[PDB]
Amino acid sequence: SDEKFTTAKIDGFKEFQNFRISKEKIPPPAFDETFKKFTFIKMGNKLI
Amino acid sequence: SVTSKYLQSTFSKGNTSHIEDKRFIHVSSRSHITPNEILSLKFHVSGSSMAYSRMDGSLTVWFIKDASFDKSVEVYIPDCCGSDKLATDLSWNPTSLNQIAVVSNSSEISLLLINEKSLTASKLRTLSLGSKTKVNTCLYDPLGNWLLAATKSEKIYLFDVKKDHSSVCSLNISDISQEDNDVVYSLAWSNGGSHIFIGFKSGYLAILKAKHGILEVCTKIKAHTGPITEIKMDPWGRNFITGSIDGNCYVWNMKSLCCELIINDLNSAVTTLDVCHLGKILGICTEDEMVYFYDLNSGNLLHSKSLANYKTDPVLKFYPDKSWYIMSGKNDTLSNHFVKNEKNLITY
Amino acid sequence: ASLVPAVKQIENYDKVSELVVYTTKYFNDFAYDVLQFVLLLRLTYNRPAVQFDGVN
């Protein structure tokens, strides 16, 4: 860790210049809570 | 990878001794015939005795005192349980140190106390039931509290071994199966007599409660698609192993009763199986004259072999007090296995 | 999804039929219901019944 911190200081601590702090407002997600419907074809396919 | 090297060493040039029985010297004299059989072979709990019964009718019992059967006495006895009738199953009565229960496909259960000073096996008692009833399997609760006797159909009896084998209860198999012409194939006790696990032929598996001496049907699950051959239990008490004839070997979790691990390399029927006293290695004897050794925890093959058309029906059993295993040989002759310097896996 | 190739292979080859009917001894009720399903499927698939030649 000391070696890594030395080589990071060498470049002038540029590795901490970029940090990307998020600023969005996170909304509560929406979950589909419904089941699909069934067609008119009682059996599987038209022929049967 | 320690276990694989251990098993390989157990299959080496040395570390192996022939169990010198009557059939062994017979083959030695006639080779240097039609092999009868080995109907059954079952240890004592304390790992210091062994018993088995050929098809001729004579049951041998050894008092293990040595590794390679050097100083092991042998009480050979002629065709017990009648001259016409031969033994099919025996239980070693964990209560005492000498008693034995033996059944001969008849209506009579023989209790004999084997003596070691002489070679005399003296009949101690005979138990009888209905005249038509033909029982063929006997079992002992691993605490020596109940005894079970089962028929191929329509009879199951439980005796209380404490109170001089007073007939405690019975049950009709048709009440347990409720299917078309089922024949119980293999039974087994739970660790500490509380439940009886029964495997029918139609595929079903049933769990009966035998808590206070009154049988009752707890549950029935459609385990397999063919007859169930063997049912074994793990010594630690966490899962029970089921092996079938359809080529599957499952291990069921004990607390929840749901399949947890499956053996998939198998492609043939199972004739028997056994798991070491440490609950670590699982030995499968399939029907193509081949044995496999799997690992219980992971489920991947760790050793294979080949019987090579010697003694078509094999037998396998792991010691209850050491990591050794008795396995059949060439012509219905037993073949011990050990390492001679490792009593248990942990010492390795 | 593994039965339909088998159903076609026994639909137009000779001995695979006897082989399959031999090996039905082993699978559980799910395979049975699905097998009956695909049988009705093939029996109802759109195709000609009589041979192209004549009334055979």
Q: In this structure, what token pair is assigned to residue B139?
A: 């079992």
Say which experimental method was used.
cryo-EM
Find the length of chain A: 48
The span from the CA of B306 to the CA of B288, in Å, is 9
Which chains share 3+ C-beta pairs under 8 angstroms with C? A, B
The span from the CA of B249 to the CA of B295, in Å, is 13
For residues B156, B193, B144 and B79, what is the CA-based torsion angle, rounded to 10 degrees?
40
The span from the CA of B237 to the CA of B232, in Å, is 11
Contacts of B203 (CB under 8 A, 6+ apart): B222, B223, B224, B225, B226, B227, B228
Declared resolution, Å: 3.4
Asked if B246 and C26 come within 8 Å (Cβ–Cβ), the reply is yes
B259-263/B38-43 β-pairing: unpaired
The span from the CA of B304 to the CA of B148, in Å, is 36
The span from the CA of B189 to the CA of B196, in Å, is 5
Q: In this structure, what token pair is assigned to residue B239?
A: 């899962």
Is A47's Cβ below 8 Å from some Cβ in C?
Answer: yes
Of B338, B322, B329, B316, which Cα lies nearest the Cα of B67?
B338
The span from the CA of B189 to the CA of B204, in Å, is 17
The span from the CA of B298 to the CA of B259, in Å, is 14
Does residue B76 sit in helix, strand or coil? Answer: coil
Q: In this structure, what token pair is assigned to residue B81?
A: 């349980």
B195-199/B259-263 β-pairing: unpaired
The span from the CA of B119 to the CA of B122, in Å, is 10
Task: Tell me which DSSP letter residue A16 carries.
Answer: G
In chain C, DSSP finds a helix count (H) and a strand count (E) of 3, 0
C-alpha pair distances (Å), B55 with each of B51, B119, B128, B182, B221: 14, 21, 23, 26, 35
Chain B: nearest CA to C25, how far in angstroms? 9
Of B245, B238, B262, which Cα lies nearest the Cα of B200?
B245
